[PDB]
Design a binder for this molecule. Sequence first.
Ligand SMILES: Cc1ccncc1NC(=O)CNc1ccnc2ccccc12
Ligand SMILES: Cc1ccncc1NC(=O)CNc1ccnc2ccccc12
Lengths: 304, 304
Amino acid sequence: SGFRKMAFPSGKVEGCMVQVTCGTTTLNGLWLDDVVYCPRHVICTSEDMLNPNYEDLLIRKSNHNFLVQAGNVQLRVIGHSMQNCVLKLKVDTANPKTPKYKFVRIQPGQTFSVLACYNGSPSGVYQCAMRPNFTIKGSFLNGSCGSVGFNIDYDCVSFCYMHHMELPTGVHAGTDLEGNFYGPFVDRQTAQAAGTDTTITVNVLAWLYAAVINGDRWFLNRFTTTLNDFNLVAMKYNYEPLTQDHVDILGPLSAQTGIAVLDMCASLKELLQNGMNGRTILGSALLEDEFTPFDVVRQCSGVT
Amino acid sequence: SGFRKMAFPSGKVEGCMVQVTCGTTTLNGLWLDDVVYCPRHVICTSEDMLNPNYEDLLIRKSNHNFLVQAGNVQLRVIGHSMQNCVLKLKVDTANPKTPKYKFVRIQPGQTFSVLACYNGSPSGVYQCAMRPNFTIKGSFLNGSCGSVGFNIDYDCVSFCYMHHMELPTGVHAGTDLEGNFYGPFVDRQTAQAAGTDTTITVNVLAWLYAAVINGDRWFLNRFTTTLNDFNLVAMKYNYEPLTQDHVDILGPLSAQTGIAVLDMCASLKELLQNGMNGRTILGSALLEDEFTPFDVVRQCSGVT
Ligand SMILES: Cc1ccncc1NC(=O)CNc1ccnc2ccccc12
Ligand SMILES: Cc1ccncc1NC(=O)CNc1ccnc2ccccc12
């Protein structure tokens, strides 16, 4: 039935997007209840970003300096406060489109959808994974800051990410909705080392299970391996070591296909050692790692 | 700044999704104004699909046999009619969430977003291209029929696709919103030849331009070619012949990067003849063809 890099339907998040302007800086804000959440660097100019003292910069700002616009209507700001790297702008109006929501701090290797916005307007939606090095490989231009990452469980939107920075390497960094950066990144225009990015092994295996379910099975072999043998190969190819927790999470996929997790590990071991030999898996010529075992189950069962 | 397979924000389409049930068959409908559009095979059972006489099947159906539910509310059906392969159910209530919309019949090689739905509920959104052989490589399970493909220009939703069939080959077929199938496909569970699928050359070139803009330039070479020389190579590798119209559409990308279209064709010629040599372009190990020149411009400029 096909397998696609699917994002969650973004409607519930679109109704929360606002434009936040402070001075000459305009970025996106997330309006939930009577609070607008945005990156605190909205108070910075291009030159302030080199070494900003956010506490000192914010002291020169009053409620009337934060211009919040939701579509064509202006929100009245009645409070402002900084929480880690996010500003919380209390407005006098609760967002009538506020969905049921939670703020969650996701784990590296987990996936989420990103609603890229400019001037408080949504332009696109795509599915991302938080890399093991806590960066995301997104698509963000000047003005995209404040764009959010989220997951949806039936009617509840779990916000997990807010975009803040583009590192000199072209990868992206941001925070959870409490303003805490994922990784060692800071909201300062300085050289920031994004460590070694490893491949999310459990996700590659989940995607191999999705491939078998959807017809792609050329890579299945007559071999098996052990967790320790597989991890020797995984280390060599900069893959995250596979744990018994990862094996357990792959349990439903192993049960559905009848292919034991360690047998799938042996297929992955051979793909790592021999490459794809000019072939593809689910329309890809590389090992895809941005589908969790939960994503594979969800897509293969049609969870709405 | 990164480059992602971005879909349009699906909010405007989510508010149009309804569940249509006829007999024991349930699929998705598109509610716009006082009309619900759905595949006419909603009137078929599993056995009817082998050789259905839609006119005869529809005659045994009355307005009260079509159960349309939008969320938790039931729509009253006051009219029903078949237009090509779609049923148009006139309801007594205009959809209050009807966006500004158009029905457009896209060209092969063009792209669009798909809002996959089950029981009238959205589960995911992904970006597709209508293949040159008029199939789409989607992600659709039982119940996904009636899910729609669309494009968005500021506030206007152009609906281009409605999902109808999964061919025995695992690829998908459907119609425009007037019920006309893309390609030679019929809404009958029979063997249907999806012809040779070619690579959308103009899209690969547009994606190579996106790669250069975003930093990936290893594939740029000291060579040039002509349209005829390039098309000899394109024919050998089952690529669509490049025309002067395609060169003209790539004009803005050629202007932005300073790389002439024929020079980009020479890079593509060498990638076709020599492969990627174990390297990647925009995180892909194959030549991506599901980004039009318009998509590349839109994403690189941040059109909301
Ligand atoms: C440009 C971009 C693209 C993708 N993702 C993120 C960004 N920008 C950043 O990393 C942060 N940049 C800025 C933070 C605060 N004030 C700023 C004021 C003027 C200009 C830039 C500012
Ligand atoms: C299964 C699927 C997955 C992805 N895309 C499409 C489909 N199904 C089809 O091609 C059409 N199938 C059916 C059309 C009408 N009535 C039907 C009644 C019972 C069962 C199936 C019916």
